[PDB]
Amino acid sequence: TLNGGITDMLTELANFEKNVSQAIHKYNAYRKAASVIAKYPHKIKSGAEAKKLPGVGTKILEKIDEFLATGKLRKLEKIRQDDTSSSINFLTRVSGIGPSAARKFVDEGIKTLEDLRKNEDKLNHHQRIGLKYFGDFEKRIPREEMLQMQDIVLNEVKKVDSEYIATVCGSFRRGAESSGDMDVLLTHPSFTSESTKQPKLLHQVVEQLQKVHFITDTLSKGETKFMGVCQLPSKNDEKEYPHRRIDIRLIPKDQYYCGVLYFTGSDIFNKNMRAHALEKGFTINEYTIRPLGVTGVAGEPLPVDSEKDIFDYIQWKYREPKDRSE
Template sequence: MSSESSKTENVNKDICNFLLELGNYERDYNRDIHRYNAYRKAAASIAKHPTRISSEKEARQLYGVGVKISQKIGIFLRTGTHPQLEEIRKSDKNNVIKELTRVFGIGPAKADILYKKGIRSIDDLKDHKDLLTSHQIIGLKYFDDFEKRIPRSEIKQIEAKIRKISKKRDNNYNLIICGSYRRGAETCGDIDGLLTHNKFTSNKPTDKNYLNIVIQELVKINLITDTLSLGFSKFMGVCQFRKNLPYRRIDLRLIPKDQYYCGILYFTGSDIFNQNMRAHALEKGYTLNEYSLRPVSKNGVPGKPVRISSEKQIFDILNYPYKKPSERDN
């Protein structure tokens, strides 16, 4: 293993996944955002730890890892699991809700309502479409296709098609597909694209709907088949590259040119990488999000956004070792 790869490998990934699963449960089923954030904070801290955690005591010494979470980590290290995790996985209600939320548009709250109405499976849903919204019906209609992973080669062709169509309409458009695709994944669950236009900036209001213009062109060529939602800055829908291929979930987000590189960084992910980088930014006296990088005054007030001309510039300003997208899964 090279020295570079050893620096980026998360040797505690199983612990992080364990904590994130508990955190997602707290968010989705108990609506406890405080505990959800605590688990995520601990997972982010552990992901940065360069060596394998071997004990509860060692975990407790890390920033963001409290007593209760460190105790759970100790049990996980000794047994490879945790009673709370096993209880979650065995619960009939939790398993039903987990299955129902596989349908796009159905979140835990809606799944809980459906469970109380006697729905126990995807097949049950097909017989009770009257309980669903129009978006959820689309999710159910394409359920089998949405479950299929999208090959990298197909996303690459879709990206090229959208870029070609948008630039043909107006050469000032720029497009990039982010998410796990940009991190180098061979298959992805959906397509997450960022669109910008050189004449669209955050400090120059416009009534020109740059996103809608592109969506209309993509509908004309039958690449976009269904619209779930379309606003000024975000499109959610369904696409199909060729008739013999599955229907795919696609999101396109319009971002002002001056926010483009912060947006690319944020929407490339991963979540844990973003958390670590935002925490580092605060240590360096900046606040970083999908919109901007801003210096923070001594009294905690963010200043004007730093003018950013590349993604790497953000790393340089923060004195944060640059990681290629393929190195950002941890």
């Protein structure tokens, strides 16, 4: 990328503000600025040039001037030397360990991978699985493997009930050549915004995927969201594939377009689009787009018959999934 040094610096700062400072709005601000700089089609020559972009303000412009001049950021060089910040940033790389638990572990003297493995009984279920697969979960998934995973999920879903439709979303649907995990949107005509005519709709699919040894572990599970672990089958004498994170979201079938807009992302794209919706007097979630009254109270859901209908309400030209990788 043209501005990878700057965007990496802002990402590291975002991660510091999220994991150490526990400042979620600074995290979002740094990530928004990193994203707008990442798609800027010029090699940035000054902080003033970057400050013209939405989400880049005075302070990031100053950091960009320091980084352009020296190749580094003193603020980050200090953060790296802080042992508490270093430890907290490492611990939060385990799935299920967030900013609060990381700081509590550091207080308790649990600061390393060796420390975590010594103290499994101090971990909740999610954290225990996150530790088990710590290395695997930092590996990316080649699109070729995503296609094999898609084949399994779609065919196994069809064996349970031919009326299910499973849609792989996330970076995969945005056409990425690799993905961090697999995101599966699921619908069934028995589950709509008006009624649930069949119990265990998500459970039956999870169960079938466990039965064929595709799903290997569960991080959390409810009526509409599964968060877990999966693994492709390997052939004779082959090294095993890495275990992969999988998310399955069962969405009311009549609300598929809002659901697939949400689950396609990216996360920053969704934040930007929902923020624009609010400025336009609407609120968007994974189910509906609703107007806002003068009181700021959301009104009744608006008719939606395509993803583009949602863009139209907020006066955005349509963006294909491949152009949503913010």
